């Protein structure tokens, strides 16, 4: 029984575990995507055609 | 007669031990409960997900 209620408690853990994975892998997706728009910005400034401005 | 006597006594006194046996049984039977819930809390007390709140 002692085991029984251990291993219910160890379930709760680890899907605790799960959620915070989820959400830090949800703020990376996020994260991931503001780099790409950055580096689709960045290879737009490198050309040749821009000046100070753009 | 004496000895018929003092086997009626005895069985009383038998009786009274496994009356004070079973009280103190329901006593740490209680006891157990309480120490298997401390458990659970201390099993999910150790997980990580926790802050210092909970």
Redesign the interface.
């Known amino acids: 029984?002692?085991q029984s209620?251990?291993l219910?408690?160890?379930v709760?853990?680890a899907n605790?575990?799960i959620?915070?994975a989820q959400t830090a892998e949800g703020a990376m997706n996020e994260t991931t995507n503001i780099l790409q728009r950055m580096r689709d910005l960045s290879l737009q400034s490198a050309n040749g055609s821009n000046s100070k401005s753009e």
């Open positions: 029984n002692v209620r251990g219910d408690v160890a709760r853990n605790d575990g959620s915070i």
